[PDB]
Coordinates of C-alpha atoms in Angstrom, one line a residue:
Chain Q
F26 CA 56.5 155.7 99.9
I27 CA 59.8 154.6 101.5
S28 CA 60.2 152.1 104.3
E29 CA 62.6 149.4 105.4
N30 CA 62.9 145.8 106.6
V31 CA 65.3 142.9 107.0
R32 CA 65.4 142.5 103.2
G33 CA 65.8 146.0 101.8
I34 CA 64.2 149.4 101.2
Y35 CA 60.8 149.3 99.7
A36 CA 59.0 151.9 97.6
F37 CA 55.2 152.3 97.6
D38 CA 52.4 154.1 95.6
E39 CA 49.7 156.1 97.3
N40 CA 47.6 153.0 97.2
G41 CA 50.1 150.4 98.5
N42 CA 51.2 148.5 95.3
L43 CA 54.9 147.9 95.1
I44 CA 56.7 150.5 93.1
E45 CA 60.3 149.5 93.3
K46 CA 62.4 147.5 95.8
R47 CA 66.1 146.9 96.2
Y48 CA 67.8 144.5 98.6
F49 CA 70.6 145.3 101.0
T50 CA 73.9 144.9 99.2
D51 CA 76.0 145.1 102.4
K52 CA 75.2 143.2 105.6
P53 CA 71.6 144.2 106.7
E54 CA 73.0 144.8 110.2
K55 CA 75.4 147.3 108.7
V56 CA 72.8 149.1 106.7
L57 CA 69.8 149.2 109.1
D58 CA 72.0 150.6 111.9
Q59 CA 72.2 153.6 109.5
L60 CA 68.8 153.9 107.8
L61 CA 67.0 153.2 111.1
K62 CA 69.0 155.9 112.8
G63 CA 68.2 158.2 109.9
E64 CA 71.5 158.0 107.9
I65 CA 71.4 157.4 104.1
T66 CA 73.1 154.4 102.7
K67 CA 74.1 153.6 99.1
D68 CA 70.9 151.5 98.6
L69 CA 68.6 154.3 99.8
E70 CA 70.3 156.7 97.3
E71 CA 70.2 154.3 94.3
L72 CA 66.6 153.6 94.9
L73 CA 65.9 157.3 95.3
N74 CA 67.4 157.9 91.9
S75 CA 65.7 155.0 90.0
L76 CA 62.4 156.0 91.6
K77 CA 63.0 159.5 90.3
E78 CA 63.8 158.3 86.7
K79 CA 60.5 156.5 87.0
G80 CA 59.0 160.0 87.3
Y81 CA 58.7 160.8 91.0
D82 CA 59.3 164.1 92.8
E83 CA 57.5 163.2 96.1
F84 CA 59.1 161.3 98.9
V85 CA 58.0 160.1 102.3
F86 CA 60.3 158.3 104.8
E87 CA 59.5 157.0 108.2
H88 CA 62.4 158.8 110.1
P89 CA 62.4 162.6 110.0
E90 CA 66.1 162.6 109.8
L91 CA 66.2 160.4 106.7
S92 CA 63.8 162.8 105.0
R93 CA 65.7 165.9 106.1
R94 CA 69.0 164.6 104.7
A95 CA 67.0 163.5 101.6
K96 CA 66.2 167.1 100.8
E97 CA 69.6 168.6 101.6
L98 CA 70.4 166.1 98.8
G99 CA 67.9 167.5 96.4
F100 CA 64.8 165.2 96.6
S101 CA 61.8 166.9 98.2
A102 CA 60.9 164.9 101.2
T103 CA 58.1 164.9 103.7
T104 CA 58.3 162.8 106.9
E105 CA 55.3 160.8 108.1
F106 CA 55.1 157.8 110.5
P107 CA 53.9 155.2 110.1
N108 CA 54.0 155.8 106.3
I109 CA 51.9 153.5 104.1
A110 CA 55.1 151.8 103.0
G111 CA 55.9 150.3 106.4
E112 CA 52.3 149.9 107.2
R113 CA 52.4 147.7 104.1
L114 CA 55.6 146.0 105.0
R115 CA 54.8 144.9 108.5
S116 CA 51.2 144.1 108.0
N117 CA 52.3 141.7 105.3
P118 CA 55.8 140.4 106.1
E119 CA 55.3 137.0 104.4
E120 CA 54.0 138.7 101.2
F121 CA 57.4 140.2 100.5
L122 CA 59.7 137.9 102.6
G123 CA 58.4 134.4 102.2
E124 CA 57.1 131.8 104.6
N125 CA 59.9 131.8 107.2
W126 CA 59.8 135.6 107.3
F127 CA 60.1 135.6 111.0
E128 CA 63.3 133.5 111.2
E129 CA 64.6 136.3 108.9
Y130 CA 63.6 139.1 111.3
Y131 CA 65.6 137.2 114.0
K132 CA 68.7 136.1 112.1
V133 CA 69.2 139.8 111.4
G134 CA 67.5 140.8 114.6
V135 CA 70.3 139.2 116.6
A136 CA 73.2 140.0 114.2
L137 CA 72.6 143.8 114.7
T138 CA 72.3 143.5 118.4
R139 CA 75.6 141.7 118.8
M140 CA 77.0 144.6 116.8
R141 CA 75.6 147.4 118.9
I142 CA 76.6 145.5 122.1
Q143 CA 80.2 145.5 123.4
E144 CA 81.6 142.3 124.8
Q145 CA 81.7 142.1 128.6
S146 CA 85.0 143.4 129.9
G147 CA 86.4 143.3 133.4
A148 CA 87.3 147.0 133.5
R149 CA 86.0 149.3 130.8
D150 CA 85.5 152.1 133.4
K151 CA 89.3 152.0 133.3
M152 CA 89.4 152.2 129.5
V153 CA 87.2 155.3 129.9
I154 CA 89.3 157.0 132.5
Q155 CA 92.2 156.6 130.0
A156 CA 90.4 158.0 127.0
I157 CA 89.2 160.7 129.3
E158 CA 92.8 161.3 130.4
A159 CA 93.8 161.4 126.7
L160 CA 91.1 163.9 125.7
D161 CA 92.8 166.2 128.2
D162 CA 96.2 165.8 126.6
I163 CA 94.8 166.5 123.1
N164 CA 93.1 169.5 124.7
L165 CA 96.6 170.8 125.2
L166 CA 97.8 170.0 121.6
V167 CA 94.8 171.9 120.2
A168 CA 95.6 174.9 122.5
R169 CA 99.2 174.6 121.2
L170 CA 98.4 174.9 117.5
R171 CA 96.8 178.3 118.1
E172 CA 99.9 180.6 117.9
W173 CA 101.4 178.2 115.3
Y174 CA 99.2 178.1 112.1
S175 CA 99.3 181.9 113.1
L176 CA 103.1 182.6 113.2
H177 CA 102.5 182.7 109.5
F178 CA 98.9 184.0 109.8
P179 CA 97.7 185.8 113.0
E180 CA 94.4 187.0 111.4
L181 CA 92.5 183.6 111.2
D182 CA 92.5 183.0 114.9
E183 CA 89.9 185.7 115.5
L184 CA 87.9 184.7 112.4
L185 CA 87.5 181.0 113.1
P186 CA 87.0 180.4 116.8
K187 CA 85.6 176.9 116.6
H188 CA 88.4 174.4 116.5
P189 CA 86.9 171.9 114.0
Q190 CA 85.8 174.7 111.7
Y191 CA 89.3 176.1 111.9
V192 CA 91.5 173.1 111.5
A193 CA 89.7 173.1 108.1
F194 CA 92.0 175.8 106.8
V195 CA 95.3 174.1 107.7
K196 CA 94.5 170.5 106.9
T197 CA 93.5 171.4 103.4
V198 CA 95.5 174.5 102.3
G199 CA 98.4 175.2 104.7
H200 CA 100.1 178.2 103.0
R201 CA 98.8 181.8 102.9
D202 CA 99.3 181.7 99.1
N203 CA 97.3 178.5 98.6
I204 CA 94.2 180.6 98.7
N205 CA 91.5 180.4 96.0
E206 CA 88.3 182.5 95.8
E207 CA 86.8 179.3 94.4
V208 CA 88.1 177.1 97.3
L209 CA 87.2 180.0 99.7
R210 CA 83.5 179.4 98.9
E211 CA 84.0 175.7 99.5
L212 CA 84.8 174.6 103.0
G213 CA 81.7 176.5 104.3
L214 CA 82.8 180.2 104.2
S215 CA 80.3 183.0 104.0
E216 CA 80.6 185.9 101.5
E217 CA 82.1 188.0 104.3
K218 CA 84.5 185.2 105.0
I219 CA 85.2 185.0 101.2
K220 CA 86.8 188.5 101.5
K221 CA 88.1 188.2 105.1
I222 CA 90.4 185.5 103.6
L223 CA 91.0 186.9 100.1
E224 CA 92.4 189.7 102.3
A225 CA 94.6 186.9 103.8
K226 CA 96.8 185.9 100.8
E227 CA 97.7 189.5 100.3
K228 CA 97.1 191.3 103.7
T229 CA 98.8 191.2 107.1
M230 CA 102.3 190.1 108.2
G231 CA 103.6 186.6 109.0
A232 CA 106.7 184.6 108.3
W233 CA 105.8 182.3 105.4
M234 CA 107.5 178.9 105.2
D235 CA 107.3 175.8 102.9
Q236 CA 108.7 173.0 105.1
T237 CA 106.9 174.4 108.2
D238 CA 103.6 174.5 106.3
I239 CA 103.9 170.7 105.9
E240 CA 104.8 170.2 109.5
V241 CA 101.7 171.9 110.8
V242 CA 99.3 170.3 108.4
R243 CA 100.8 167.0 109.8
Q244 CA 99.8 168.3 113.2
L245 CA 96.2 168.9 112.3
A246 CA 96.0 165.5 110.8
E247 CA 96.9 163.9 114.1
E248 CA 94.9 166.3 116.2
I249 CA 91.5 165.6 114.7
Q250 CA 91.8 161.9 114.9
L251 CA 92.8 161.2 118.4
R252 CA 90.2 163.8 119.4
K253 CA 87.1 162.3 117.7
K254 CA 88.0 158.8 118.7
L255 CA 88.3 159.8 122.3
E256 CA 85.0 161.7 122.3
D257 CA 83.2 159.0 120.3
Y258 CA 84.6 156.0 122.2
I259 CA 84.1 157.7 125.5
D260 CA 80.4 158.0 124.5
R261 CA 79.7 154.6 122.9
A262 CA 81.5 153.0 125.8
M263 CA 79.8 155.0 128.5
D264 CA 76.8 153.0 127.4
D265 CA 78.2 149.7 128.7
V266 CA 79.7 151.0 131.9
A267 CA 77.4 153.6 133.2
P268 CA 74.3 154.4 131.0
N269 CA 72.5 155.8 134.0
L270 CA 75.4 158.0 135.1
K271 CA 75.6 158.9 131.5
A272 CA 72.1 159.9 130.6
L273 CA 72.1 161.8 133.9
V274 CA 74.7 164.5 133.1
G275 CA 76.1 163.7 129.6
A276 CA 78.7 161.0 129.0
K277 CA 81.6 163.5 129.6
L278 CA 80.9 164.9 133.1
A279 CA 79.9 161.3 133.6
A280 CA 83.3 159.9 132.5
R281 CA 84.8 162.8 134.4
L282 CA 83.1 161.5 137.5
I283 CA 84.2 158.0 137.1
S284 CA 87.7 159.2 136.4
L285 CA 87.7 161.7 139.2
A286 CA 86.9 158.9 141.6
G287 CA 89.2 156.6 139.8
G288 CA 86.9 153.8 138.7
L289 CA 83.3 152.8 138.9
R290 CA 83.2 150.9 142.1
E291 CA 84.9 153.9 143.7
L292 CA 82.3 156.2 142.5
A293 CA 79.5 154.0 143.6
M294 CA 81.0 153.9 147.1
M295 CA 80.4 157.6 147.3
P296 CA 77.7 159.2 149.4
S297 CA 75.7 162.2 147.9
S298 CA 78.0 164.4 150.0
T299 CA 81.3 162.9 148.7
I300 CA 79.8 163.3 145.2
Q301 CA 78.6 166.9 145.7
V302 CA 82.2 167.9 146.1
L303 CA 83.9 165.3 143.9
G304 CA 85.6 167.4 141.3
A305 CA 87.4 170.2 143.1
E306 CA 88.9 171.9 146.1
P307 CA 89.3 178.3 143.1
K308 CA 87.4 175.3 141.7
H309 CA 84.8 173.5 143.9
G310 CA 82.6 170.6 142.8
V311 CA 82.9 169.2 139.3
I312 CA 79.2 168.5 139.1
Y313 CA 78.4 172.2 139.3
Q314 CA 79.0 172.3 135.6
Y315 CA 75.5 171.0 135.3
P316 CA 73.4 173.2 133.0
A317 CA 70.7 174.1 135.7
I318 CA 73.3 174.7 138.5
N319 CA 75.3 177.1 136.4
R320 CA 72.4 179.1 135.0
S321 CA 71.3 179.6 138.6
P322 CA 72.3 182.2 141.3
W323 CA 74.9 180.8 143.7
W324 CA 72.5 181.1 146.6
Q325 CA 70.3 178.4 145.0
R326 CA 73.0 176.1 143.6
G327 CA 74.0 174.5 146.9
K328 CA 70.5 173.2 147.0
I329 CA 70.2 171.7 143.5
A330 CA 73.7 170.3 143.6
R331 CA 72.6 168.3 146.6
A332 CA 69.7 166.8 144.6
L333 CA 72.0 166.0 141.7
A334 CA 74.5 164.1 144.0
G335 CA 71.6 162.0 145.3
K336 CA 70.6 160.9 141.8
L337 CA 74.2 160.5 140.6
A338 CA 74.8 158.2 143.5
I339 CA 71.8 156.0 142.6
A340 CA 72.9 156.1 139.0
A341 CA 76.2 154.8 140.1
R342 CA 75.0 152.1 142.4
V343 CA 72.7 150.5 139.7
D344 CA 75.3 151.3 137.0
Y345 CA 77.9 149.6 139.1
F346 CA 75.8 146.5 139.6
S347 CA 73.1 145.9 136.9
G348 CA 73.0 148.9 134.6
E349 CA 69.2 149.1 134.4
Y350 CA 68.2 152.3 132.7
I351 CA 66.3 154.3 135.3
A352 CA 67.6 157.6 134.2
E353 CA 64.3 158.9 133.1
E354 CA 62.6 158.6 136.5
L355 CA 65.6 160.2 138.2
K356 CA 65.8 163.0 135.6
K357 CA 62.1 163.5 136.2
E358 CA 62.3 163.2 140.0
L359 CA 65.1 165.8 139.8
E360 CA 63.4 168.2 137.5
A361 CA 60.5 168.2 139.9
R362 CA 62.6 168.9 143.1
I363 CA 64.2 171.9 141.4
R364 CA 61.0 173.7 140.4
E365 CA 60.3 173.8 144.1
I366 CA 63.8 175.3 144.6
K367 CA 62.2 178.3 142.9
Chain A
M265 CA 53.7 116.2 147.8
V266 CA 54.3 118.1 144.5
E267 CA 51.2 118.5 142.3
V268 CA 50.7 120.4 139.0
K269 CA 47.5 121.5 137.3
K270 CA 46.1 123.8 134.7
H271 CA 45.4 127.5 135.5
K272 CA 42.6 129.9 134.6
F273 CA 44.7 130.8 131.6
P274 CA 46.2 129.1 128.5
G275 CA 49.8 128.0 128.9
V276 CA 49.5 128.9 132.6
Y277 CA 49.8 126.2 135.3
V278 CA 49.3 126.1 139.1
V279 CA 51.4 123.9 141.4
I280 CA 51.2 123.0 145.1
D281 CA 54.1 121.4 147.0
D282 CA 55.3 120.0 150.3
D283 CA 54.3 123.2 152.2
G284 CA 50.7 122.8 150.9
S285 CA 50.6 126.2 149.2
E286 CA 50.1 127.1 145.6
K287 CA 52.5 128.9 143.2
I288 CA 52.2 129.8 139.5
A289 CA 54.2 127.9 136.8
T290 CA 54.7 128.0 133.0
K291 CA 55.5 125.3 130.4
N292 CA 59.2 125.9 129.9
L293 CA 59.6 125.9 126.1
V294 CA 63.3 124.9 126.4
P295 CA 64.3 121.8 128.5
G296 CA 67.1 122.4 131.0
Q297 CA 67.2 126.1 130.0
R298 CA 67.1 128.1 133.3
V299 CA 66.9 131.9 133.3
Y300 CA 66.8 134.1 136.4
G301 CA 67.9 131.5 138.9
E302 CA 64.6 129.7 138.5
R303 CA 62.7 127.2 140.6
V304 CA 61.7 124.5 138.1
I305 CA 59.9 121.2 138.4
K306 CA 59.0 118.0 136.5
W307 CA 55.9 115.9 136.5
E308 CA 55.6 113.0 134.0
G309 CA 58.3 114.4 131.8
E310 CA 57.7 118.1 131.5
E311 CA 59.7 121.0 133.0
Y312 CA 57.2 123.5 134.3
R313 CA 58.9 126.6 135.6
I314 CA 58.1 128.6 138.7
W315 CA 56.9 132.1 137.8
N316 CA 58.0 133.7 141.0
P317 CA 56.2 137.1 141.3
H318 CA 58.7 138.9 143.4
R319 CA 61.0 138.7 140.3
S320 CA 58.3 139.4 137.7
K321 CA 55.6 142.0 137.9
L322 CA 53.3 139.8 136.0
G323 CA 53.7 137.0 138.5
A324 CA 51.9 139.5 140.6
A325 CA 49.2 140.5 138.2
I326 CA 48.4 136.8 137.7
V327 CA 48.9 135.6 141.2
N328 CA 46.8 138.5 142.4
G329 CA 44.3 137.1 139.9
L330 CA 44.3 138.8 136.5
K331 CA 41.1 138.5 134.5
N332 CA 42.1 139.2 130.9
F333 CA 45.5 138.0 129.9
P334 CA 45.7 138.7 126.1
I335 CA 48.9 136.8 125.9
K336 CA 47.6 133.5 124.6
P337 CA 49.7 130.9 122.8
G338 CA 50.5 131.8 119.2
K339 CA 50.0 135.5 119.9
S340 CA 53.0 137.7 118.8
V341 CA 53.6 140.5 121.2
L342 CA 55.8 143.6 121.2
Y343 CA 57.5 144.0 124.6
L344 CA 59.0 147.3 125.9
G345 CA 61.4 146.2 128.6
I346 CA 62.7 142.6 128.0
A347 CA 65.9 143.3 130.2
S348 CA 67.7 140.3 131.7
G349 CA 65.0 138.2 130.3
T350 CA 63.1 137.2 133.5
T351 CA 59.6 138.7 133.6
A352 CA 59.6 137.8 129.9
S353 CA 61.1 134.3 129.7
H354 CA 57.8 133.0 130.9
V355 CA 55.8 134.9 128.3
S356 CA 57.9 133.0 125.7
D357 CA 56.8 129.7 127.2
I358 CA 53.1 130.7 127.1
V359 CA 53.3 131.9 123.5
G360 CA 54.8 128.8 121.9
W361 CA 56.8 128.2 118.8
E362 CA 53.8 129.6 117.0
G363 CA 53.9 132.9 118.9
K364 CA 56.4 135.7 118.7
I365 CA 58.1 138.4 120.8
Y366 CA 60.0 141.6 120.0
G367 CA 61.7 142.7 123.2
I368 CA 63.2 146.2 123.7
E369 CA 65.1 147.3 126.9
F370 CA 67.7 149.8 125.8
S371 CA 70.7 149.2 128.1
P372 CA 73.0 147.0 126.2
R373 CA 75.0 146.2 129.3
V374 CA 71.8 144.3 130.4
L375 CA 70.2 143.0 127.2
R376 CA 73.6 141.5 126.5
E377 CA 72.6 138.6 128.7
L378 CA 69.3 137.7 127.0
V379 CA 71.4 137.3 123.8
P380 CA 72.5 133.7 124.6
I381 CA 69.0 132.7 125.7
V382 CA 67.6 133.4 122.2
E383 CA 69.9 130.7 120.8
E384 CA 67.6 127.8 121.8
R385 CA 64.8 130.1 122.9
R386 CA 64.5 131.1 119.2
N387 CA 61.2 132.7 120.1
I388 CA 62.3 136.2 121.0
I389 CA 64.2 139.0 119.1
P390 CA 66.8 140.7 121.4
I391 CA 66.4 144.2 119.9
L392 CA 68.6 146.7 121.6
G393 CA 66.2 149.6 120.9
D394 CA 64.4 152.5 122.5
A395 CA 60.7 152.7 122.9
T396 CA 60.4 156.5 123.2
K397 CA 61.8 156.6 119.7
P398 CA 59.6 154.0 118.0
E399 CA 60.6 154.6 114.3
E400 CA 64.1 153.6 115.1
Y401 CA 63.2 149.9 114.9
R402 CA 60.7 150.0 112.1
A403 CA 62.7 147.2 110.5
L404 CA 63.1 144.5 113.1
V405 CA 59.5 144.2 114.3
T406 CA 56.2 143.6 112.7
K407 CA 52.5 144.2 113.6
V408 CA 52.1 142.4 116.9
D409 CA 49.0 141.3 118.8
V410 CA 50.0 142.5 122.3
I411 CA 52.1 145.4 123.4
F412 CA 53.5 144.8 126.8
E413 CA 55.2 147.9 128.4
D414 CA 57.4 147.7 131.4
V415 CA 59.6 150.8 131.3
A416 CA 60.9 153.1 134.0
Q417 CA 60.0 156.0 131.7
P418 CA 57.7 158.7 133.2
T419 CA 55.6 159.0 130.0
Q420 CA 54.6 155.4 130.0
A421 CA 51.2 156.7 128.8
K422 CA 52.2 158.2 125.4
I423 CA 54.8 155.5 124.9
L424 CA 52.2 152.8 125.1
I425 CA 49.8 154.8 122.9
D426 CA 52.5 155.4 120.3
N427 CA 54.1 152.0 120.0
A428 CA 50.5 151.0 119.8
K429 CA 49.6 153.3 116.9
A430 CA 52.6 151.8 115.1
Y431 CA 52.6 148.0 115.6
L432 CA 49.3 146.9 117.2
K433 CA 46.7 145.2 115.0
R434 CA 43.2 146.5 115.4
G435 CA 41.6 144.3 118.0
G436 CA 45.0 143.8 119.5
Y437 CA 45.5 144.5 123.2
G438 CA 48.1 146.1 125.4
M439 CA 49.4 145.7 129.0
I440 CA 51.4 148.4 130.8
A441 CA 52.8 147.7 134.3
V442 CA 52.5 151.3 135.5
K443 CA 54.6 152.6 138.5
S444 CA 52.9 155.5 140.2
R445 CA 55.8 157.8 141.1
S446 CA 57.5 156.7 137.9
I447 CA 54.9 159.0 136.3
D448 CA 54.8 161.6 139.1
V449 CA 56.9 161.8 142.2
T450 CA 54.7 164.5 143.7
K451 CA 51.2 163.3 142.7
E452 CA 49.1 160.8 144.9
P453 CA 49.1 157.3 143.4
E454 CA 45.3 156.9 143.5
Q455 CA 45.1 160.3 141.7
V456 CA 47.7 159.3 139.1
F457 CA 46.0 156.1 138.0
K458 CA 42.9 158.2 137.4
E459 CA 45.0 160.4 135.1
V460 CA 46.7 157.4 133.4
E461 CA 43.4 155.5 132.9
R462 CA 42.3 158.9 131.5
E463 CA 45.0 159.7 129.0
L464 CA 45.4 156.1 128.2
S465 CA 41.7 155.6 127.4
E466 CA 41.6 158.5 125.0
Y467 CA 42.8 156.1 122.3
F468 CA 42.0 152.8 124.0
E469 CA 39.1 150.7 125.3
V470 CA 40.2 150.4 129.0
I471 CA 39.6 146.7 129.9
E472 CA 40.9 146.5 133.5
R473 CA 42.9 148.5 136.1
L474 CA 44.7 145.8 138.3
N475 CA 46.6 146.6 141.5
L476 CA 49.8 144.8 142.5
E477 CA 50.2 145.3 146.2
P478 CA 51.9 143.7 148.2
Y479 CA 54.4 142.5 145.5
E480 CA 55.0 146.1 144.4
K481 CA 53.9 149.4 146.0
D482 CA 51.9 151.6 143.6
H483 CA 52.2 149.2 140.7
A484 CA 49.1 148.5 138.5
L485 CA 48.9 146.3 135.3
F486 CA 46.4 148.0 133.0
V487 CA 45.0 146.2 130.0
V488 CA 43.9 148.3 127.1
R489 CA 42.2 147.2 123.9
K490 CA 42.6 148.9 120.5
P491 CA 39.1 149.3 119.0

């Protein structure tokens, strides 16, 4: 069935004749970056519908994400690679594309890359340190909302623990008395949570307000957006500056390391030892936040931590210089030195 | 003295210079376009480039005397590692404006440099991509003739196999510069290549297991054929 190329999404019968096609309405480089990744764009929905009103209930996509979001959409979707659609597209590019089909795989080949690839910048490690520094200040604002949305409603706090699930209530409703049983369902609330909140509008004490309500909602508006940004920029720009360091311990602890040392160079200049303790001095060693170090008994940690610092060092050095992605080997090497620690 | 002749292989040339020794060289497909700090040369009007093997791991395979070098001219090839462009600039020269290359190293920081090159060297697609996740570039490649894998992954084996099952025409080939410890940092090299040639050839027709000493410790450019 469904596959993709530089021209559009194609649709194929069990035997490989062309069912329906539809060309990319928006820049290919904008669309592929989504479909390829597994996200559904307007052209992949419109073709999903017209394919249906042609009398189809079966769908097969090449990326298991596409076909998982395809069925949380309604359409029954199986996921098989390489599906006879792409096996039909690639084996016969010229059939569909034309003679210069290659040129076309390049034109758009390049375009998309120049997208995904950030322009060279003297100090992006510094841009990260910042955005990391900010994500720390927003941590405080989020902590601050807590007692607030609550002055008027103390109950919620215990009910919704997860900030993003929580800031849902404020942003959209505000006032205790803005509660619907029909907007209680929507938002993602369970049946239990459809009574734990219909018990809200009419149960518990808390000093209602009308002007305050629209002060706090203005607070949640500005809390989400600097947050995301920061988290999402800190990631997609940890890819230019220290992809090795990144894929080692996650872009955050990564960014925390760069920051903690105050730049990339600085980190690189650090021996395993200086890195095994970079983070703290009762805190002691930022890198101990590593999954495998934490889940372990203190008597074994000192050992693993050593091994981490050795690989983070390398990650830095290369990252500093070239940024050739050698994480895998090192993640491997490391996973193999730890099993011996047991 | 500075003399330049044809090699065993198509699009491959051998040169001998003032020091009376021989060095590989490829027909640079783009005059005055120098990648990787090259040593180039010029005979009766052509700019043959020095395929220095310290820099490329194929230099080695070839200078160490490779037998089957499926990379002819015209032959489109998938390439898992295209990085700075070095060990892979040559393979554009060999292939020719009739051949093709889809190259795939995933660290943008790096790739970012090969992006200029492809302006005149319009014979490579600089795909920022990942070759552990093949599907995710099902739209910027096409069935190739030769998969060439150079990746510091530790599963080089199933990576080659899987890119293969996706984009490699029957009768196509495949070349994987395998590091030993890259696959296992605890298992003896000799014993590893026996396990690679094993797993690898459970889907392939193993053509040739070629060592790379003394250009690279425990490196070994295999050459599989897809029956």
